[PDB]
């Protein structure tokens, strides 16, 4: 399905970046979650790719990248390629990306996430630099999912009173050149702690906000940098450096990204519920807010609960622009005068049906109305 997005480069210009795409349809199958992925990445002509990766919620960092545009620099370096709720990063080598598919479960292909960064990047093979005058605390900068998270102690409490604190930092590794900066003026000890200074962190827009907090105490303080743009092109044993000035002292720590599976990737559920006494239970699908009263396409894919097998009598029909309304499933779907579908189940049953419907109208947010039928 088509969900356009706009992205602008921020801070410095690292070659690698993460383009979050939680917008495409995703279903809470809780069992078999096959998902065919096809990606197109433009550059400059357009070096279209043929990225293909079919991983359920069992392998979150797979990166099969059989290309067709030539020997491109890199694509979808996977360290958190699935980590998060629907987050599918597309990392490159340290650009008007047009993703095309997440799951099949029927016949509809589209996606989009436009980035205004350079179409073709530049190699950024950083020479090994150690910063001799930087005390290496060798703390473990574990990159949980994609966003970095550290609690390293700050540089020094030199001239704490009326200090134009600046926390400009940078992370280095396997040919990655990304440096963080601290925006919004110059923080000077506001409140006892949790200064919440916004961090540009370079990289990309970082839809989830990224910033560090200067947890001052009394006189030893700390620092809690949270730069989100951290991806797989880092080395397995790489080093980041933090430069905190006052009134310039640096600290070095070891960064190791983890390739693991997240808590969940499915789209957030509306968790709607209905109650029935008659087995011919029908549920009215609420109108999605982001879509007006008229739209050229809208689908109500009725999926069962805990499907141990592959797809079964589950209808993804009832679309607009001359769409087939005769659901091949065991169930039957209907609607009303207003565009609110009334979906009837295949006789339901004594057990809760817990059927899942993801009504994704065009240019509207996907609302997976996971409804758990309850008897009397």
């Amino acid at each position: 399905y088509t969900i356009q997005s706009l992205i602008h480069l921020t801070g410095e210009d690292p070659g690698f970046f993460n383009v979050e795409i939680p917008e495409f349809p995703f279903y809470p199958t809780c069992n078999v979650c096959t998902a065919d992925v096809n990606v197109t990445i433009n550059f400059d002509h357009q070096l279209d790719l043929d990225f293909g990766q079919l991983t359920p919620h069992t392998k979150a960092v797979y990166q099969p990248r059989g290309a067709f545009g030539g020997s491109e620099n890199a694509t979808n370096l996977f360290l958190l390629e699935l980590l998060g709720a629907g987050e599918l990063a597309l990392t490159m080598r340290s650009e008007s990306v047009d993703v095309y598919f997440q799951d099949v479960f029927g016949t509809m292909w589209c996606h989009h996430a436009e980035m205004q960064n350079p179409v073709y990047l530049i190699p950024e093979t950083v020479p090994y630099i150690k910063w001799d005058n930087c005390n290496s605390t060798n703390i473990t900068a574990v990159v949980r999912a994609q966003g970095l998270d550290v609690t390293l102690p700050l540089s020094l409490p030199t001239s704490a009173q009326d200090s134009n604190f600046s926390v400009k930092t940078q992370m280095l590794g396997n040919e990655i050149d990304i440096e963080c900066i601290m925006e919004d003026g110059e923080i000077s000890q506001v409140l006892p702690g949790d200064n919440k200074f916004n961090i540009t962190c370079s990289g990309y827009e970082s839809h989830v906000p990224s910033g560090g907090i200067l947890t001052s105490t009394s006189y030893a303080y700390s620092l809690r940098l949270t730069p989100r743009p951290v991806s797989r092109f880092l080395g397995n044993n790489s080093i980041l450096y933090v430069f905190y000035s006052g009134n310039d002292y640096c600290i070095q720590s070891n960064i190791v990204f983890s390739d693991e599976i997240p808590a969940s990737q499915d789209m957030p559920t509306n968790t709607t519920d209905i109650t029935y006494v008659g087995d011919n239970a029908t549920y009215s699908v609420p109108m999605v807010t982001s879509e007006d009263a008229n739209s050229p396409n809208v689908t109500v894919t009725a999926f069962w609960a805990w499907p141990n097998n592959t797809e079964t009598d589950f209808k993804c029909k009832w679309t607009l622009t001359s769409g087939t309304p005769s659901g091949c499933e065991n169930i039957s779907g209907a609607f009303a005068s207003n565009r609110t579908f009334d979906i009837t189940v295949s006789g339901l049953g004594t057990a809760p049906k817990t059927l899942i419907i993801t009504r994704t109208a065009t240019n509207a947010t996907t609302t997976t109305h996971k409804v758990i039928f309850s008897k009397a």
Binding site: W131, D132, Q170, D248
Partner: protein, 120 residues
Amino acid sequence: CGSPPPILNGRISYYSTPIAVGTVIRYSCSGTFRLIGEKSLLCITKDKVDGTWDKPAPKCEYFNKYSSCPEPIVPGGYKIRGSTPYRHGDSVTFACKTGNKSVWCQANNMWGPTRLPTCV
């Protein structure tokens, strides 16, 4: 190349203790003062082992506090890592399909340590 040229309250990074070797060093900002100038530093080798560093030491001071500066452009110049908004000592990068490839924004505005570079 002997000894690196120091900057104002900045950083010199790592070079060990070489006998005129000093392969790679990096210069960082002074913190509250943004770095206005190319940060890289590699010791080029002349006919003799002893030589000079590739680039002069960049200045590390304020750049118009938080005020902005004119967009630096040249017909043979792109805007890599550059955008309409500006703050303090932010820089851009230049290139062309057919000169230097860097310029900053200082307090004097319209440039940083050096003027907006031209191109062939």
